[PDB]
Design a protein around this ligand. Structure first.
Ligand SMILES: COc1cccc(Oc2cc(Cl)cc(NC(=O)Cc3cncc4ccccc34)c2)n1
Ligand SMILES: COc1cccc(Oc2cc(Cl)cc(NC(=O)Cc3cncc4ccccc34)c2)n1
Lengths: 304, 304
């Protein structure tokens, strides 16, 4: 029993982290096979970042300008290319610690672990969700760029995120491993609206099921609701509309607890309308949306 | 910016996890050098656990009865001994992945990362605190015994906790790596009181400083207090008394923000007496006590 914001074991990703330096800028890279992936803004100086022409800035750089270091050993760069907002530095040595991996584009509302790095060295690991507005509420300082987000399925690491920047609002933006930003963001120091965020309804319901499984049940009531009635409440409280696909994804948790999804929606409706009244759920005084239904089953079943 | 419940990168610990089986019981072990450490209750059957005589139960076991497996390879056991509540299985092979390590006994109120394991395989990593009452509020299922808690300082892993059991209250108990339980607990299936827990005052103040650094400042007020006046409030709200040693440990955060420790205590006093009024701090609607002053500085400075 117990329910924690659990990250994946980071070992397989730690073995891929390297330091990339170009000119006076140092950030993290991801060494997989004979390629090092890193944010393309490594080639910018502070003046460049206001309105960079990346194609022009990259043309002034040669293979020998990209200093790549894995621990204490230097990697020899034999190629460089830009794909969207990432640079791919071909090196003459395949990473011996390359795990089985995939590059995936996660959907908003999905979760992943972040291995925060500085100077190619891992500092910490935490679990977070890709917000509905495509930002992440991470914990990153200057030098953390190139730190990655990932999920692990047995022995396969699915890389889904590479850190690029912090918006003036304090939230974070980045790309998939093909360099495509999540959200409307550009790698430029200019005004950027993140847009309205919403609470991830299916994750809140999953976490309410996690609460029931772990013994916190005070919020269960004698009521039920319909998808339409629930969605009127979700609208008022800036929650994502719940669809039948979400109800279906909650199937396993509904079967495990014997609490119909619409009955759990009625519990959520009452908590949204009445608040917690000073009570807590799984150690939280607010409704948690960073656990997907998959995360709840995985944590409550101990998948390794 | 941003503030997360960040765990240490778990790689160095993942390389030490092995599976230990004795009879019909399987749990995790920690392989460091040529010794595998695991909870001694691995030698118990379900009947034994109500009132086990560990000395007698261990006498019926020989080296060949302890099956130790590291991934797919079997380790050869050449010795066994019980030290307090842990078994030390001497193996004929030193763990090639043994990191630089120490065995430490943490103080209540200190934090550490837990690498939850099942069948010697890592499932997840999370950060938690040793409660003032010497329990941990973890996330553990059956089979998780032998999973360890640790802290990392550059390249040295300080192991502080080994998981042994879950109390009927849903909280967790375990030992240091010399097999000494934290708290009054015994490795027996009998009624066990954890005793009154308290909120870790110095950690709450550290987290309030983390909030100020990251931009959440609404709770700062025009007031100050004294250690004595603050401790009257801490008493009423089941918070640990704040000492001058705690004020001294908060020195760096006080200097970083320019907010005197007693002024921060006055902010905490007002939040304790008035609540949050429906507002949040660092994404939390309650006062967080799982970050030590050291954790706040480390996360806010990006130490690797
Ligand atoms: C003015 O609005 C914006 C909006 C989006 C971006 C912006 O500037 C940019 C543009 C580019 Cl190309 C890269 C960056 N790099 C970073 O933000 C680096 C970084 C990452 N994480 C945490 C950090 C904490 C503190 C300091 C820096 C951090 C910024 N300005
Ligand atoms: C009846 O009171 C108690 C108090 C303390 C212990 C007790 O029983 C004991 C005594 C011993 Cl020696 C070992 C154990 N082992 C465990 O608790 C194993 C375990 C660990 N973590 C999470 C778990 C979740 C679900 C099931 C088992 C879990 C229990 N009973």
């Amino acid at each position: 029993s117990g329910f924690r914001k659990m990250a994946f074991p980071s070992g397989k990703v730690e073995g891929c982290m390297v330091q990339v330096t170009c000119g006076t800028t140092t950030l993290n890279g991801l060494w997989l096979d004979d390629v090092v992936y890193c944010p393309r803004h490594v080639i910018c100086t502070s003046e460049d970042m206001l309105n960079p022409n990346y194609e022009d800035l990259l043309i002034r750089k040669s293979n020998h300008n990209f200093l790549v270091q894995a621990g204490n050993v230097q990697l020899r760069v034999i190629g460089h290319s830009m794909q969207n907002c990432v640079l791919k530095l071909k090196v003459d040595t395949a990473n011996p610690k390359t795990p089985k991996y995939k590059f995936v584009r996660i959907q908003p509302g999905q979760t992943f672990s972040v291995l925060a790095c500085y100077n190619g060295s891992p500092s910490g690991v935490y679990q977070c969700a890709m917000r509905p507005n495509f930002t992440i509420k991470g914990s990153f300082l200057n030098g953390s760029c190139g730190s990655v987000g990932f999920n692990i399925d047995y022995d396969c690491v699915s890389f889904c995120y590479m850190h690029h920047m912090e918006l003036p609002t304090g939230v974070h933006a980045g790309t998939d491993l093909e360099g495509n930003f999540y959200g409307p963001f550009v790698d430029r120091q200019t005004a950027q609206a993140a847009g309205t965020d919403t609470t991830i309804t299916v994750n809140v319901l999953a976490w309410l099921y996690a609460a029931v499984i772990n013994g916190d049940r005070w919020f269960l009531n004698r009521f039920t609701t319909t998808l339409n009635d629930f969605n009127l409440v979700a609208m008022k409280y800036n929650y994502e509309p719940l669809t039948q696909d979400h109800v279906d994804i909650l199937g396993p948790l509904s079967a495990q607890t014997g609490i119909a999804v619409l009955d759990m929606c009625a519990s959520l409706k009452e908590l949204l309308q009445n608040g917690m009244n000073g009570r807590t759920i799984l150690g939280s005084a607010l409704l948690e949306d960073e656990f997907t239904p998959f995360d709840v089953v995985r944590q409550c079943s101990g998948v390794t």
